[PDB]
Design a protein around this ligand. Structure first.
Ligand SMILES: Nc1ncnc2c1ncn2[C@@H]1O[C@H](COP(=O)(O)OP(=O)(O)OP(=O)(O)O)[C@@H](O)[C@H]1O
Lengths: 97, 209, 47, 97, 239, 230, 380, 248
């Protein structure tokens, strides 16, 4: 499953995490299938970092993703690999083992 | 006929059926912080009678401030797991829509849910609820963020006294740490989380191992 | 507000109406019109 | 601020020592104060209080009794609460000027 | 922070100097790495020399420069900047003989070179200089000495040092080697330096690519090793 | 527009650039100074980033005159420039008045040098804070010169990372009737509180200014005090 | 004078061991004029050593309290505040040895009033700890926690010598252990106390060591007890006391009351200090309740002898009364199930009709009483 | 907008950078002086008191500038050290040229012209220091003066500059009596004014620094009162408040 995130962020910044949870459930359906966060930064126009017009909704989604990855949504030995060089900034807390 | 009431806080009350699942026993070593947060949040709902007997009006808001990784949120989720109240943690940004001063939408949901079951408890984190696309001060820009602080302060004032909407805040930010937020009647109790020292570390290490 | 004998209106809310996708003149023009309906009226603003 | 739109600009001062005693009495009305408590001294102990702070001293003092499982509030409990409600901030070497 | 002192050598919130920190990055922009190893009686400098086109003289392109008969340096960074530092170091070493009646101690050349760099940071109207200098010389009563200087003006004495793109990994290999108790002889120090570049780059370079400069207690003069001598060491370490 | 220049006043309070320089001083290796009845003891945490760095090269506690010594918290390159200037001013005093510079006067003269950089222009202020010590006039003297140019005297003080923790430790254990040897133990202990690692003779550099002069303790001597507790 | 002081210290050490307690007491009376001759600040530390020397000599509490009071009178005559405050602190510790019912509390209370006024915080923390220990001895747990909390807050601001920090930590363990709400935190404090006690206070460390081992048995993880004694830190103090805790942990792992009883019988000295293990035996008799359920199930299987007393685990017939104590309050929920051969253990007492009708009839008759008033007043 | 350069002039003819510096003096220890017939006095608040700080230096806010003159400094610490040195230099330079102690108004005008220059020249920021001058000169007798970062100066029978200056000026204007100051009475006025301006309770001796300048036997004798002298004045003020009790 390719997490480009263009489909995941549609009309609601908040819904992006919820849509990712739906994708995670779809990933849970196939144990061999592995989530791939390819082009995670890629989005309509350009990724929105903290700003007056648009804040870092993607960074909030990344923190939400960390919560989804461990505890609430981990089953079927499915790996949500963030195998992407697309994001400009990598969260230090994410880097933690 | 009248249909049964519709809609629920976030996905549903108490963070839906999604309990955090971290027990207080699992959070080992934050003994002083655990006791203080429990008195401010869990005890008023469980034993309002004790507070009425001394006529103290239960302390409501709690501020938890510490160097990152010190155990405040594991405790915050733990309070949600051990709570019998509708503790919709309601981190500031989640199901919230684009809005200006969205502090009212979150609090209004809490009052209804607290009335439906037991006084609800709110944890303030993911504080990016605002900074929405439909947002921007006329020229100051910073003023719009200040407008959010004022809107939250108005809601916090006194909320449903006995069905108190307890608010737990763990933001290490001085900009939203105005004296007014720190004033008693807003964040009544302040707990500072120290970096685990010897003995506290021994407890964290023993529990994890 | 308790000891008033007059309508008390509380309008501490911010701007959700006006030219936003919300409604028009609700914060001010509508609030005064409601206060006109109840002649003894006091409006408390918190900003 | 123009006078026709706003005729009066009433100012609420930080409570005076007499006022702090009055607020302290109002918020100590339901508390079971032990005989020998000096409310007047407690108002003097906190100068330039915010009034809500005087309300805070009572709530914190009551909790000291609640943790000790007693309904009998004592003079020491008010004094300890005054310190807890009071907050002090300082920095070093920035004491230029 | 960023967007504050980015355009000037001025303080930033949290007291960070952005223009001077950017200078350390420019040394890596050179695309070359250098390793220097101290020894019981020897100091060895090794660098990778890349001949971009056949129509270029190998002799002309050298990043190993002698500053004084007993003092030699390896320059990592922008070429123009490295050469300017070399003239200043030669002038200061010469003045030390001229004003003090004795040859500059290697420690003293570094302080003087670092002090010139520091002034550029404190006072504006100068680019910090995108180069790092490692100096090797033998000092009586101090043994062979390896010393390194930074664009910021930081100077330090190092048992082993590296600079350029692969500095972090090179130091890591050196840290394991240095941790071993055995002291290194001239052969071992040449071998450790060549191996450190070999492990970090994986090139298995031919004798032409590596440039080695060595100063020894027995022969105090800084000597640039000839290609034939470089090959003899390179074949021996492979065995 | 403010906070980018030291030549302009804040539109209310004070110039922010000097305060940013204080931030760089705060991001420095811990330095503890303990004035004692018979001497002043100064100390700093010297930890090499890697085993390769030689611990016998650049020295954090550096003598300025026979009876005067200096320690620093802040940017290391800036310290060497003021270490040289302070030493030179001490020599100019000797040539003019044939007496070793009094410690109080040296601090005032060093402070004037630091203030010149804070003056208007491209020049940026020193990012170092200093702890001058002396035995002049038969009295131990400990002083601090900040980047701004203010000078103050401390019975005991700390600068660099965890200054607050060190100062609170000093408040609890510093008396006044203590010999330099007892002061050496307290100085080592305050560094230990903020030391991220096991202190070793190489890790800590300690300098004493008794009624004999400022002598940096030999690595062997530092080890003996680090051993047997402290 | 200074030479006499070292000679007096040498004489005092001999009097502490070879010398009689009366001879040591005579020396203290002899050095009262000498105390006046020497500087008062030096005299106070000398007095501490002399009192410790008297403690080293065979205990004579009637003489010891009298000598301490005489020393207090000498300090009162000299009007030296430091000596008197210290003398009271030694006397309250001496009272704690005799477990004075209120005398230990009384002296501490008087000292606390002077000490809160005084700037000698180190003495204040020690006296506060003594009050917590005496309250625990008298069984007043909330006051004991309060004395401990006050001691900790005073100690946090002031510098703490190693013995003070360790004593403070162990007391946190004793109060936390006594509450029984959390034993995990109590173990952490006891280990911190033992770690501090190591080397600096060798006699004190074994007592903390025994408590941390007891905590492991109490925490329901008896296996770790053997591992902790095996650890190098505990190897130095390893001894018969360590063995007693090891066998008790094994008994709890075996879940055998007889094994726990055998351990209790084997080490009488270890049994005297801790009664929390007695509470564990009570949990163990409740642990065998399931066997009583099989013995009660024995009629459903084969009833033999009594099935409530003689049959259960065979053993003594005094097993009855443990069951009787259980029968009062919650328990098996079966009254004397010894005779039957089928077993009748069940409880069904919550019929809603009886409770709801009983409440409504009382409430309904209140209408009858009220209706009578309404009708009677209109009638006449 | 029209900020930054001291050189720019606002459309209302206002030099904001100079104005900002004058406002800045407020964040400084209180300094007050009373002209006092037969004497003159300078009183300062010793802020930033801490147990560790030695306070070995004689004085801290009070500096003599001549045999017959003294000043109290309130402002940026570094700028104060620069100005005090120049004031000391100007005093000796006049003595060298004319062999007479500098008249007090002149020393003030000279520093004020230097302070004024910084405002008129683009490169430098306006000085952030304001100071009070106490001295005796034959031409005009005992005098007290105030200098501003703007470079303006004035002679005041009584004035205050640091912290709550307006509160001290209001208290001083009512309490002060012209021609009847009588030094000891002026010292009492200072202790009472200090108690009001300082938020400190009981006005402990460490918090207050008092320097008194008197002409004795034809020689000015500037003296900084020792802590014991300061303590007795504080006890007398406290006793006077006790006398005021019941009557008030
Ligand atoms: N008492 C504890 N017992 C065991 N583990 C703990 C305890 N406290 C913290 N931890 C561990 O440390 C982690 C970090 O905790 P947490 O993220 O809640 O810290 P925090 O300071 O509240 O930061 P944040 O507010 O960013 O969440 C926890 O998820 C857990 O793994």
């Amino acid at each position: 499953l390719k997490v480009v995130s263009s489909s995941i962020v549609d009309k609601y910044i908040g819904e992006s995490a919820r849509l990712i949870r739906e994708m995670f459930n779809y990933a849970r359906d196939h144990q061999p299938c592995i989530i791939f966060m390819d082009e995670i930064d890629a989005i309509g126009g350009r990724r929105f970092s903290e700003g007056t017009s648009a804040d870092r909704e993607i960074q909030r989604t990344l923190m939400e993703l960390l919560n989804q990855m461990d505890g609430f949504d981990t089953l079927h030995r499915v790996k949500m690999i963030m195998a992407t060089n697309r994001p400009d900034t990598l969260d230090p807390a994410l880097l933690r083992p | 006929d009248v249909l049964p009431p519709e809609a629920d806080s976030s996905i549903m009350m108490l963070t839906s059926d999604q309990k955090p699942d971290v027990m207080y026993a699992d959070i080992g070593g934050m003994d002083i912080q655990k006791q203080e947060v429990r008195e401010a949040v869990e005890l008023p709902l469980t034993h309002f009678e004790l507070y009425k007997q001394i006529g103290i009006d239960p302390p409501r808001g709690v501020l938890m401030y510490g160097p990152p990784g010190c155990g405040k949120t594991m405790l915050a989720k733990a309070v949600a797991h051990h709570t019998t109240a509708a503790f919709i943690r309601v981190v500031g940004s989640e199901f919230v829509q684009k809005y200006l001063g969205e502090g009212p939408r979150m609090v209004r949901d809490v009052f209804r849910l607290a009335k439906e079951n037991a006084p609800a408890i709110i944890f303030i984190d993911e504080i990016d609820a605002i900074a929405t696309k439909r947002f921007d001060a006329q020229t100051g820009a910073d003023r719009e963020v200040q407008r959010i602080l004022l809107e939250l302060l108005n809601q916090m004032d006194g909320f449903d006294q006995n069905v108190n909407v307890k608010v737990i805040m763990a933001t290490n930010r001085a900009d939203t740490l105005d004296p007014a937020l720190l004033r008693p009647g807003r964040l009544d109790r302040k707990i500072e989380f120290p970096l685990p020292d010897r003995r506290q570390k021994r407890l964290i290490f023993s529990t994890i191992t | 507000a308790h000891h008033t004998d007059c309508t008390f209106i509380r309008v501490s809310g911010s701007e959700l109406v006006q030219k936003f996708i919300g409604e028009g003149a609700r914060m001010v023009r509508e609030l005064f019109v409601m206060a006109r309906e109840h002649a003894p009226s006091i409006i408390f603003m918190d900003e | 601020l123009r006078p026709g739109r706003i005729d009066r600009k009433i100012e609420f001062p930080p409570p005076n020592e007499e006022a702090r005693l009055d607020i302290l009495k109002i918020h100590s009305r339901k508390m079971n104060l032990t005989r020998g408590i000096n409310l007047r001294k407690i108002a003097e102990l906190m100068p330039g209080a915010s009034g809500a702070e005087v309300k805070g001293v009572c709530t914190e003092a009551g909790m000291y009794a609640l943790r000790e499982r007693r309904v009998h509030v004592t003079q020491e409990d008010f004094e300890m609460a005054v310190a807890k409600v009071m907050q002090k901030d300082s920095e070093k070497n920035m004491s230029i000027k | 922070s960023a967007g504050f002192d980015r355009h000037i050598t001025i303080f930033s919130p949290e007291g960070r100097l952005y223009q001077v920190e950017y200078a350390f990055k420019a040394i890596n922009q050179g695309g070359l790495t250098s390793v220097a190893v101290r020894g019981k009686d020897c100091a060895v400098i090794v660098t990778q020399k890349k001949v971009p086109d056949k129509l270029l003289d190998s002799s002309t392109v050298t990043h190993l420069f002698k500053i004084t008969e007993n003092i030699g340096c390896v320059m990592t960074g922008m070429t123009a900047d490295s050469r300017s530092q070399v003239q200043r170091a030669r002038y200061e070493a010469a003045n030390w003989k001229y004003k003090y009646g004795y040859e500059i101690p290697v420690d003293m050349l570094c302080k003087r070179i670092a002090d010139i760099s520091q002034v550029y940071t404190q006072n504006a109207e100068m680019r910090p200089l995108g180069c790092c200098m490692i100096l090797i010389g033998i000092d009586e009563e101090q043994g062979p000495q390896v010393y390194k200087c930074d664009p910021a003006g930081y100077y330090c004495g190092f048992k082993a040092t590296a600079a350029g793109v692969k500095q972090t990994e090179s130091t890591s290999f050196l840290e394991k080697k240095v941790k071993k108790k055995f002291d290194w002889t001239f052969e071992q120090t040449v071998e450790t330096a060549i191996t450190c570049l070999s492990t970090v780059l994986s090139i298995d370079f031919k004798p032409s690519e590596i440039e080695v400069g060595v100063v020894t207690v027995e022969n105090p003069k800084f000597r640039i090793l000839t290609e034939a001598e470089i090959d003899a060491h390179l074949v021996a370490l492979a065995e | 527009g403010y906070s980018f220049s030291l030549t302009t006043f804040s539109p209310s309070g004070k110039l922010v650039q000097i305060e940013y320089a204080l931030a760089a001083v705060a991001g420095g290796a811990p330095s503890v100074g303990i004035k004692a009845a018979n001497g002043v003891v100064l100390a700093t945490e010297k930890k090499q980033k890697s085993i390769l760095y030689d611990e016998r090269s650049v020295h954090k506690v550096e003598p300025i005159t026979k009876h005067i010594g200096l320690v620093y918290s802040g940017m290391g390159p800036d310290y060497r420039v003021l270490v040289h200037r302070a030493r030179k001013l001490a020599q100019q005093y000797y040539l003019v008045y044939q007496e070793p510079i009094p410690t109080a006067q040296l601090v005032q003269r060093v402070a004037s040098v630091m203030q010149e950089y804070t003056q208007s222009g491209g020049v940026r202020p020193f990012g170092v804070s200093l702890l001058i010590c002396g035995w002049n006039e038969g009295r131990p003297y400990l002083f601090q010169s900040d980047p701004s140019g203010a000078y103050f005297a401390w019975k005991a003080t700390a600068m660099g990372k965890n200054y607050v923790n060190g100062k609170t430790f000093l408040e609890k254990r510093y008396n006044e009737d203590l010999e330099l040897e007892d002061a050496i133990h307290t100085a080592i202990l305050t560094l230990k509180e903020s030391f991220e690692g096991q202190m070793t003779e190489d890790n800590i550099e300690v300098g004493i200014c008794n009624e004999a002069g400022f002598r940096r303790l030999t690595p062997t001597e530092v080890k003996d005090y680090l051993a047997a507790i402290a | 004078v200074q030479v006499k002081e070292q000679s007096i210290l040498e004489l005092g050490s001999l009097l502490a061991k070879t010398g009689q307690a009366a001879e040591l007491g005579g020396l203290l009376k002899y050095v009262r004029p000498f105390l006046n001759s020497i500087s008062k600040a030096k005299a106070a530390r000398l007095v501490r050593s002399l009192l410790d020397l008297f403690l080293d000599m065979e205990a004579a509490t009637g003489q010891e309290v009298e000598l301490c009071l005489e020393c207090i009178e000498w300090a009162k005559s000299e009007k030296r505040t430091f000596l008197r405050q210290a003398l009271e602190a030694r006397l309250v510790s001496l009272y704690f040895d005799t477990k004075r019912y209120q005398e230990a509390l009384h002296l501490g209370s008087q000292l606390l009033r002077e000490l809160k006024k005084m700037d000698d915080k180190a003495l204040l923390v020690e006296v506060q700890l003594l009050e917590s220990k005496t309250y625990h001895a008298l069984s007043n747990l909330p006051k004991a926690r309060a004395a401990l909390t006050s001691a900790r807050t005073t100690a946090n601001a002031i510098y703490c010598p190693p013995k003070l920090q360790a004593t403070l930590d162990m007391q946190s363990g004793i109060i936390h252990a006594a509450e029984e709400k959390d034993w995990k935190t109590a173990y952490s404090y006891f280990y911190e106390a033992f770690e501090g006690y190591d080397s600096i206070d060798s006699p004190k460390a074994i007592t903390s060591l025994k408590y941390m081992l007891l905590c492991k048995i109490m925490l329901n993880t008896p296996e770790d007890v053997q591992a902790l004694v095996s650890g190098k830190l505990a190897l130095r103090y390893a001894g018969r006391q360590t063995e007693a805790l090891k066998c008790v942990a094994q008994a709890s792992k075996n879940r055998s009351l007889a094994d726990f009883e055998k351990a209790l019988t084997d080490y009488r000295a270890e049994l005297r200090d801790d009664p929390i293990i007695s509470t564990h035996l009570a949990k163990l008799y409740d642990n065998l309740l399931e066997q009583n359920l099989i013995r009660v199930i024995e009629p459903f299987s084969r009833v033999q002898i009594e099935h409530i007393s003689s049959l259960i685990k065979l053993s003594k017939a005094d097993v009855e009364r443990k069951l009787s104590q259980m029968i009062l309050d919650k328990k098996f929920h079966g009254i004397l199930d010894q005779g039957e051969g089928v077993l009748i253990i069940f409880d069904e007492p919550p019929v809603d009709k009886t409770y709801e009708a009983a409440l409504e009839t009382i409430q309904n008759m209140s209408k009858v009483v009220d209706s009578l008033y309404n009708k009677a007043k209109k009638l006449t | 907008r029209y900020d930054s350069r001291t050189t720019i002039f606002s459309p209302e003819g206002r030099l904001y950078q100079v104005e900002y510096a004058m406002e800045a003096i407020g964040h400084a220890g209180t300094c007050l002086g009373i002209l006092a017939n037969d004497g003159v006095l300078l009183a300062a608040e010793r802020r930033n008191i801490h147990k560790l700080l030695d306070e070995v230096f004689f004085s801290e806010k009070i500096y003599k500038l001549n045999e017959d003159m003294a000043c109290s400094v309130a402002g940026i610490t570094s700028d104060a050290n620069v100005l005090t040195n120049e004031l000391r230099l100007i005093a000796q330079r006049y003595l060298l040229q004319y062999q007479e102690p500098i008249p007090c108004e002149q020393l003030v005008t000279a520093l004020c012209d230097i302070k004024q220059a910084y405002t008129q020249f683009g490169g430098k920021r306006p000085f952030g220091v304001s100071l009070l001058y106490i001295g005796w000169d034959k031409h005009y007798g005992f005098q007290l003066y105030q200098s501003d970062p703007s470079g303006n100066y004035g002679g005041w029978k009584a004035t205050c500059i640091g912290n709550n200056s307006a509160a001290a000026v209001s208290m001083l204007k009512q309490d002060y009596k012209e021609g009847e100051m009588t030094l000891k009475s002026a010292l009492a006025l200072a202790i009472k004014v200090l108690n009001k301006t300082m938020d400190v309770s009981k006005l402990s001796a460490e918090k207050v620094e008092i320097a008194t300048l008197t002409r004795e036997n034809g020689k000015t004798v500037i003296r900084v009162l020792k802590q014991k002298e300061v303590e007795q004045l504080i006890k007398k003020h406290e006793e006077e408040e006790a006398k005021a009790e019941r009557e008030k």
